[PDB]
Design a protein around this nucleic acid. Structure first.
Ligand SMILES: [Zn+2]
Length: 183
DNA sequence: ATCGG
């Protein structure tokens, strides 16, 4: 029930400038009792520390660590929606671990909305394709998703969502890139 | 300004 600072949101989820951090706004909705809204929240990655020897944990793994805390009923079907700053990586095992989670728990269906494509990982295409081939929806965040996260996850205090310059442009471009990757 | 130093 603790919301997100507006400057952090507009700083990390900017699809024009790529940040050195990753945030993840997750929703968990029950499907068919009646369809309900059961869990919402957000988290961020754990920064890698060279001096202490810590390699860091990306936001996807940070969410996979939280799944036991959700008390998901194995008899019902849940839809998990991600609004992640960077697309999940491959070289560091995130896409593989998410695919592993999706295979053990077939009652959970995941859809991922990425604000930016993590093309720093040379195998980002293999990550997105692996996520698609595992039954998870892979999409790029558009204005509707940014405004949604602003209205439900951000402590806006009544201030409406003011889109940054190039939101629709970069969102369309990344949508085209992802459409070209998932062929 | 690409999961940070
Ligand atoms: Zn990762």
């Amino acid at each position: 029930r603790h919301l997100m600072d507006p400057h952090i949101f507009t700083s990390n989820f900017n699809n024009g400038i790529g940040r050195h951090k990753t945030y993840l706004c997750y929703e968990v909705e029950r499907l068919d009792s009646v369809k309900m809204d059961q869990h919402r929240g957000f988290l961020h990655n754990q920064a890698k520390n060279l001096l202490c020897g810590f390699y860091g944990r990306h936001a996807a793994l940070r969410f996979l660590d939280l799944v036991p805390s959700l008390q998901l009923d194995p008899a019902q079907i849940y839809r998990v929606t991600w609004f992640i700053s960077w697309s999940p990586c491959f070289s560091w095992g995130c896409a593989g671990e998410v695919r592993a989670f999706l295979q053990e728990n077939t009652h959970v269906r995941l859809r991922i909305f990425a604000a930016r494509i993590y093309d720093y990982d040379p195998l980002y295409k293999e990550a997105l394709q692996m996520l698609r081939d595992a039954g998870a929806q892979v999409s790029i965040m558009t204005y509707d998703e940014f405004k949604h996260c602003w209205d439900t996850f951000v402590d806006h205090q009544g201030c409406p969502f003011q889109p940054w310059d190039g939101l629709d442009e970069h969102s369309q471009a990344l949508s085209g890139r992802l459409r070209a990757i998932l062929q």
